[PDB]
Design a binder for this molecule. Structure first.
Ligand SMILES: [Mg+2]
Ligand SMILES: [Mg+2]
Ligand SMILES: [Mg+2]
Ligand SMILES: [Mg+2]
Lengths: 436, 436
C-alpha cells in the first residue's frame, strides 16, 4: 500500500477520536509451534492495516491533541547486531519515522517506562480490550501508574473506548489499492484451483492435492494460505472444516477443495467440488446442479441495495425445490421453506465478508446479515449441499458434499467476480479434467 | 508408532515414578493465526511421544500404585455431532480406551470436577510446571481442592516433581521404530534438497525455491516442515535464521538452504549451500572446502565415547587453519584458537540433538556440550562459515554464508548418516546442476 493509503487510514481513525486522546494498536504476539520453534509470523490485521509493518514487539500510538493536531509514536524492536546475525534484520528507531511515517520511535523494551507518560492526563484512550493478554497488561499497568501517581501530578484517563468498531467499519469498505490486491489474491487462488483439477487422479492422497495448491500459491508470491486448506474426498467433503486431508482420493467420489492464498495480507477464498475421476455420476451431477443454480442466481443478484439475507431467500428456494425433485425432501415447497427443511443439508451462511481476514471484520447488522450492500464491500458467495453418509435419503445421494464458492466486490452496478477464472460449470470441469 | 512402542514408553516412565504417584501430561493449546483462524495444530511433543494423539484438550494421567500395579486415565473432547460436522471428527470417550490403550477416558470439560479425585491421597504428582498456563491452572486447582477438603477426607500429594528431566532423557535415546521414522524423514528431506539444486536458476525468488522443497515434502506424506525453511541467497546466507525468503536469487551468489520435513512427528534437518548459477567462484569454492573438510572430519569422528565438545575442537582447528591460509584470519594458529578468532565466522554450535523437535530435548551436560555420546543418540552435524559483507577480510570473501548439515545416528561403532543421499562435494553439486 502506498504511504498515502496508510496515512489516510490513520487520519480517518484520528477523525473519530476526541481531542485529548490516544489510540493504541498492538502487534501480534509470536506463536510457538513446538519448544523453541515458532510458526511463521502473522502480523495483527488491524496493526498491518495502519502500518504495513510486519515485526512483532511493536506498538503504534496515535495521539490527538485537537482537530488539527495529532502525532504518532511507535515502540518497536531495537537494532542489535547479534540478534540480527541470528534472527534477521530489524527496522529500529532511527529508520522508523521515515519508513513508517511516524513522528517518533522508541524501543519496545522501554514501553512500560514510557507509555504511562504518553497517556498522562489524556481524557480517553482507545484500546482493543481482551484481544491480547500482553497488550492488556501493558495498557492496564500504565493506567494504574497514572491512578497511583497523584503526588507526581499524574492522572489517568477515565475512559477506555474500543477502536475496533470504527476500524472494522473502515476495513469493511475496500479502497482501490485494496481491491487490486484482492484481485490478485483471487487470481492466484483460481490458478491453484485449476491446477488441482488438472492434477487430480484416483489414488492420489488429499494432502497431495493440497501440495499442488500450496506450491501454486508460493510461485506467485503468496507463501501462506489464508486458512488451512480443505481437501475433502467422498464422505470427508460432508465435514465443513475437514483439514486432516489424510485419505486416498477414490475413483467414484467427489473431492471438495476450499483453498485461498494470503497475498500481501489479503485473503482469497475459493471452493470448487469436482469428481476425482473426471466424470460426475448422475447423483453427483444432480446435487451439483442445484448448488450451481444457487451460486449463479446469487451472482446475478448481489448488488448495492440488496443484502445477504435477501439473496439467501432465493438460494433457499432453489435448494428446497431441487431437493424435493431428488426425493431428499418431500412435501409442499412453501411449507418446507417455512420449516427451513434445507437446514440439514445447507447449514451455514451464503456469504461472509472478505479482506485481511478470511472471515473479515465488519458489522453484518444482525445474525441474519440484513446489512444493506454498498460499493466496496467484498464478500464470498458459497452455497453448498452436504448429504451425510447416514442421511435419511435415497441411498444414491449419501456421502455427497458439494460447495461452490467465489469472491466478489460490490460495484456501483452489481458486482465484480474476482474468482470466475476457475471453471464451475460441470461440463467445463469435465472438459478441463479430460485434457489431463 | 505401534501400540507396543507407546506401551514401552509409558512403562519406562512409570518405572521411574514412586509408588503412590501420578504423572500428568497435557496436549498443546491451539494457536491462533488471525482472528478466528488457527494455525495447523501441532501436538505437544511429549504428549505425542506418549500417545500419538493429535487432538487439543486432551490430558494423559499415568497412575502408579506400586511396582507391579498402574493404570491410566485420558481426558479428551467428547463426541458431538454438530462440532464434528463443522470442525472434524473426534475420538471421544467410548473409542479411546482401545485406540490409545488407556484404562478409562473422561470428558475434558469435566476435568476440574474429576482430576482432584484421581490425585487424592497420592504422595507425588509429576507435572511440567510453567509449560502451559492452562495446565498449571488445572493442576494447581485440583491440588487446592484436595488441600481444602480434609472435611471430605481428601488429602493432597505433598510433592510436585518435574517429569521433563526423565522423559527428555528417554527421548534422547531412539528406539528402532524411531530410527526407521528418522531415516525416512532424512530421505524425504534429502530428496527435497536435491530438487532445489535441480530447480534453482538465477532470477528465481528465494520463496520459489522454498515452494519446491515444501511440495516435495508433501508428495511423500510430510505435510509440514519441522521448522521454517531458510533460503538465504548472497548476503542473506550470512543471517542464520533468515526466513523472509523474499529476494531474487542472483547470478554469482551462493544460496544456503536449511530445510527439513516433519514426518510422522519426527524432524529432518539438512543444510546445503550451492551456487545459484551452478558454478562456484574460486572464493566461494575455497570457503566451501573448509566447511566440507569440517563436516567430513566430524562424520569420521562421531562415535560412542566422544562428545560434541571434543569434535568441535577439531572443527575449529580445521577452520582456523583454512581461514589463515586464505588470509581471512592473520596470525599463529594456536594463538588464534586460544583467542577464539573463528567466532566472528562460525558463531553457533556444531551439533544439536534431533528428534520430535528439531532442536531436540536431552541434556548436553554443559554449555560446551560435553555429553558423552552413546548408541541411539541422534544429532545434526552442521559446520558453517559466515563472512559478513563488511568483514575486514580480503574483499572477494565478503558476503559468503556457507553451512553444510547432515543428520546422524550414533551406532555401536560409529554413526549412520541419514542424509548423505543429497550431494555435498562441490564438483558433485556442479555436475548435478549442469544436468539441469
Ligand atoms: Mg468462505
Ligand atoms: Mg471457503
Ligand atoms: Mg538446520
Ligand atoms: Mg540443525
Amino acid at each position: 500500500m502506498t504511504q498515502q493509503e496508510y496515512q489516510n487510514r490513520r487520519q480517518a481513525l484520528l477523525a473519530k477520536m476526541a481531542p485529548g486522546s490516544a489510540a493504541i494498536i498492538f502487534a501480534a504476539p509470536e506463536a510457538t509451534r513446538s519448544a523453541d520453534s515458532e510458526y511463521p509470523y502473522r502480523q495483527n490485521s488491524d496493526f498491518s492495516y495502519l502500518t504495513g509493518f510486519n515485526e512483532p514487539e511493536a506498538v503504534l500510538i496515535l495521539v490527538k491533541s485537537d482537530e488539527t493536531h495529532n502525532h504518532s509514536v511507535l515502540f518497536n524492536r531495537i537494532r542489535d547486531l547479534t540478534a540480527e546475525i541470528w534472527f534477521g534484520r530489524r527496522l529500529g528507531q532511527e529508520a522508523a519515522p521515515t519508513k513508517l511515517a511516524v513522528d517518533r520511535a522508541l524501543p519496545f523494551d522501554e514501553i512500560n517506562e514510557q507509555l504511562y507518560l504518553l497517556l498522562n492526563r489524556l481524557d480517553v484512550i482507545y484500546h482493543a480490550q481482551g484481544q491480547y493478554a500482553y497488550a492488556d497488561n501493558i495498557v492496564f499497568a500504565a493506567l494504574e501508574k497514572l491512578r497511583h501517581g497523584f503526588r507526581k501530578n499524574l492522572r489517568a484517563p477515565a475512559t477506555l473506548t474500543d477502536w475496533r468498531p470504527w476500524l472494522h467499519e473502515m476495513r469493511l469498505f475496500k479502497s482501490a489499492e485494496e481491491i487490486a490486491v484482492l484481485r490478485r489474491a483471487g487470481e492466484i487462488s483460481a490458478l491453484a484451483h485449476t491446477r488441482a483439477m488438472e492434477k487430480c487422479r484416483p489414488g492420489m492422497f488429499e494432502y497431495q492435492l493440497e501440495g499442488e495448491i500450496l506450491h501454486e500459491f508460493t510461485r506467485h508470491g503468496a507463501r501462506y494460505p489464508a486458512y488451512n486448506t480443505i481437501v475433502g474426498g467422498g464422505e470427508n467433503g460432508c465435514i465443513l472444516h475437514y483439514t486432516e486431508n489424510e485419505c486416498e482420493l477414490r475413483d467414484g467420489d467427489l473431492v471438495l477443495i476450499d483453498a485461498g492464498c494470503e497475498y500481501r495480507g489479503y485473503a482469497g477464498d475459493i471452493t470448487r467440488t469436482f469428481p476425482v475421476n473426471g466424470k460426475f455420476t448422475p447423483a453427483q451431477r444432480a446435487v451439483y446442479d442445484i448448488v450451481l443454480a444457487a451460486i449463479n442466481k446469487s451472482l446475478t443478484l448481489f448488488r448495492p441495495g440488496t443484502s445477504i439475507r435477501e439473496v439467501t431467500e432465493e438460494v433457499v428456494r432453489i435448494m428446497v425445490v431441487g431437493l424435493v425433485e431428488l426425493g431428499i425432501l418431500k412435501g409442499d415447497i412453501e411449507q418446507l421453506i417455512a420449516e427451513q427443511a434445507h437446514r440439514p443439508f445447507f447449514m451455514h451462511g451464503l456469504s461472509h465478508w472478505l479482506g485481511m481476514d478470511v472471515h473479515d471484520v465488519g458489522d453484518y447488522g444482525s445474525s441474519d446479515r440484513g446489512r444493506i450492500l454498498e460499493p466496496g464491500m467484498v464478500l464470498t458467495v458459497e452455497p453448498g449441499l452436504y448429504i451425510a453418509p447416514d442421511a435419511d435419503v435415497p441411498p444414491q445421494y449419501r456421502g455427497i458434499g458439494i460447495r461452490i464458492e467465489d469472491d466478489i466486490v460490490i460495484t456501483a452496478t452489481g458486482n465484480e467476480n474476482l474468482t470466475a477464472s476457475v471453471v464451475k460449470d460441470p461440463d467445463d470441469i469435465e472438459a478441463l479434467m479430460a485434457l489431463n
